[model samples]
Target: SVDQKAISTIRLLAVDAVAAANSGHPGAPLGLAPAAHAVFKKMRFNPKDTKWINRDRFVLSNGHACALLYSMLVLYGYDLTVEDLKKFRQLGSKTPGHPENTDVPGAEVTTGPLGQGICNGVGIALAQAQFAATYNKPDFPISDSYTYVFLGDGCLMEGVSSEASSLAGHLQLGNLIAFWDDNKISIDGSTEVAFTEDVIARYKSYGWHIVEVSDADTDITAIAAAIDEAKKVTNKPTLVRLTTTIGFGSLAQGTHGVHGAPLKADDIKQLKTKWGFNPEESFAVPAEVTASYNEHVAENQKIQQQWNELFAAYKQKYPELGAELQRRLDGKLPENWDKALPVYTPADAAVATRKLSEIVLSKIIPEVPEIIGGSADLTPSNLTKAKGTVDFQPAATGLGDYSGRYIRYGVREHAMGAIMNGIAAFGANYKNYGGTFLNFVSYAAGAVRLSALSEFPITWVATHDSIGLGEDGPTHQPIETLAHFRATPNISVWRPADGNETSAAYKSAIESTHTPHILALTRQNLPQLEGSSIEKASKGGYTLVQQDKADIIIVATGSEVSLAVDALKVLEGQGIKAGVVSLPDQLTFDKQSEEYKLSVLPDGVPILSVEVMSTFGWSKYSHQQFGLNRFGASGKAPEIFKLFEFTPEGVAERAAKTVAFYKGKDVVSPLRSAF
Candidate 1:
């Protein structure tokens, strides 16, 4: 009887919150409340300690229904309160239209965009398995947890969900349990209009264990039983199909009308009366329900207490791993881990930035145990996998063990991006990364943006940065890609020129705690610049060559930095002094002190920017921009460079033109702001 009341309370809280805000999706929240109640009771989590690594995680993939999540959190005594729900979707409230991890205390990841949350769940499960395999010894179950996600028909229809589901099945991620709300209703109308695939059969094809709850609207027992059945299958992720009515218990139940809008006043009255509550009450929470949920919270808190004891004992037994785990739990990386980053000199032979990335991985993967990554089926080309590391496969597959550092992400860039967010969210100071060609990173833009919004320290190893990719042509060359991501707030877009700059990029990525990074690396070889060093490149923007009486200055990124150097030699021959500034990352450089930025791009000299890509954000740092604003062609790498006029003489000519244009003019640093 109390279970019914609890479910009714959750449903009412969500409904009233939507009604109060005069916004949000009410249908799925009402339909999914019973399932939410059962799942939260089954989950082992402490609302007081949200980041406990051993706690179960919940993801609301269909974030339109986040009122349900907020209701559950409020009932279970998370930081959110009933007043927070009353302020739902209001300005500056914790309960926004969609769930944001940064705003909500209990939210594990931001989940407004359909399909991204399920992929994040997959990443969370992957990290759990890896952490358990790496840390858990006999009687020391230090890192065993589960990731549960609730998604809807819209999520399943999203192509990104399919990519992550396929990979989750292949990974044999048994800790991942997802519940599909099969209400057969989309915003337009019924699923019969579109989305007519047999989802259960498809999941089975992906090797997922399936359980069907035909009467999910009224059967909490079956829902709880489904979770038990899912846990029994230890080799595959489980998908539980919950057949519910859209907007269950509403006057317009099962209709698309009730899907996105709040209920009418009379309809709300009827719902409250039918649920045995006061008809006039808007945000009602029964004391009995609170007591029941509080009991579960108390039990979960005790479990965490015992886990703390187990950890102390574990530290006594295995001093090394225990200390490592302690350090990770403390959210600290290995002491002086950056020392392992590969350093290079100008005397070193020329190498592709991609190969330099591989060298950095080879040196650092062993030093920082928390560093783990793989490519999106471009391991050979992206050069992301460190040598001597095993693949992160199930032990039974004989491919690699769960403890393996490298992952074979196949061709799923979007899923790889979201999964990296999940790994970062797993909270053991994981500096997880994924690799793909620079152009194809756009395929995962949805997840990449979420990685930034969620403030996760994820890295994208994007190779084949520009026309230098050559024979791949415009189809695979990234002209607008870097510009797109660089414009996104809180993303460090690194385009390293040579070995030292690549090392600096990796160092920034690995040391990051909140910022997401995309390292755009080159396919063709680049000679190490004489003035480039890890220390100098770490500034994000540094003057590679200084000419005090210079008439012009050249600033460039990636492969263009080397061209800027050669252009200086040509400018010297022409009796025109030119300084060179190498900008490796715009986001990081923008964060430097304004005085420091002014010193690099000072007044009294015309600054010209050179990069064979979109010139979108270059105006912020340079007075004149020299970039290929059009698509590239298929040819040899050197030929492509010449065709684009991205050579010494070409750059020298642009610098002279820029110098002449600014002659006898008052030029100020671009860093100056007129506030």
Candidate 2:
């Protein structure tokens, strides 16, 4: 009773939603509805508790099939309703043209971008494995779960999926199961125009268990069996290549015409009638199918109760371990989590921000067991290794295969970023971060945007922030990287000045809930300022040096904060009272209260910002911005600073000039806006 008729209903809903929206893809969702229903009904997950950490994760890589997912979520008792489904692709509705994770409760990742979900699935699998290794004892298997991704032909065509698939196969991620919907029809026509290579052969060569479902349109038994077989393959990931036709029951089936545009009203009526639906009925789910789907929810609740009983027994046997495990599961930081944040006095001496980051990691990793990450083959340069943590590699000799805490991402920066987002998306229970050159962060910008949009508490340790990375030339330096990331909404980009500010940046980065933080570290050493402290720097921007009725206020960030401090003294000696403001994170400062911002950079003081990079967007906060509008010379950092007029005297001179200009204009205040 819950067979072809139920599947046809799902297909019709997708078709109807897309047709109503007038701007969505209907082919794949219509064709692959059977497989999707089978998987959703059989998957071990509780719709009532969407954030269940142990529940299996499902990612629809082909986000164009959002209508299918939205319909299923509504049918299965998620927050989505039939009314919401009706408003699909409308403004201010949860149901968008493509599935976005933040917009929908059941959607795993914001996955309109092709190939990103594949790499994100790898991240989820990695997170599951790491969490299992760290927390799951003999009796408590709380972290055990699998990640499933439903990918389409477009996902397969993208290069990122291939890269991630290769890495997933190499890691032997047995819990990752990807169902490839080989519907053949693309927006431009048949895939024969560009994609003729054997997909299964490529996946098998990548060391995956490749299974084929010859007819997925009406073969629920065959699809379920392949999934079971995938779970049985304990040494390798499984790829079930399901071959189906696009728009299966439509007159225009198996063609590109049904790929994106809406179906005609007559075509819809004919298709519904042909598929055994009363042609007038819309959004109908028969009693038998509803009952069958409800069984999955009941089974999940039963599993949850059983697991709670097991956990009670686990708590009795091991109280301390149980408390820690429960705390992590609750997404709470361990007691005294901030004890590891290093405090530095002036005598501790100047050091590179990258080195300070390493010191922070070395102290924090022992306390926080869930913290795990590594660089993209740039660990030495990025300095992201947790002091005692072993490397996560395929070799058994390194860290007992999957037992290592650190991951070696090879040279794949793009995949590494997507993987980190996936790891962060593995519920709120686990914390994941990564490292790479600041310039290379651009390579993973798309994935990083997902982290910000989804509000994942992920950290990016990006070293070589500016042209201070001497001798590597302009290729390695990130002149506009900070500006570019600042433009991205909901992300905090921190360029710490010295050891104390670096510690403060790490503390805030870890404490944040939804915003992903990027720590832009320096390769060159920076002096510890007199007023720098973790508490003060946590304000994001604060007064490093104060003056009574200052003629000009010099605001700077990162390595240039010390320059502001030195410039303040020089200006004071020249009978020009100047104040200094150290801004570690512009994004964080922008979020501060108006009173707090005014206290730091007071009113009626001409503000001059000095940074050793592009001055493109700094005019918002400064009357005149002093920064390198061009490339850096091949020399030592100090020499390069001097060459670019970043010296204390140069800054003081510019500050004086800015003050004279403001005074001539008879401006009452330099602070423009509270924000």
Task: Give TM-scores for every candidate, taking all chains together and pairing residue i with residue i.
Answer: 0.99, 0.96
Compose the digit string of candidate 1's lDDT tens values, residues 507-563. Answer: 999999989999999999999988999898888999999989988889999999999
lDDT value, residue 70 of candidate 2: 90
Top-lDDT structure, candidate number: 1
Assess candidate 1 and give its lDDT.
0.93
Residue lDDT tens for model 2, 120-223: 99999988887777667876786678898999899999877887898888888999999998988788788999899999999999999988999998898999
Candidate 2, 493: how far from true, in Å? 0.5
lDDT of 2: 0.84
How many times do residue backbones clash in model 1? Answer: 0
- Model 1 residue 495 lDDT score: 93
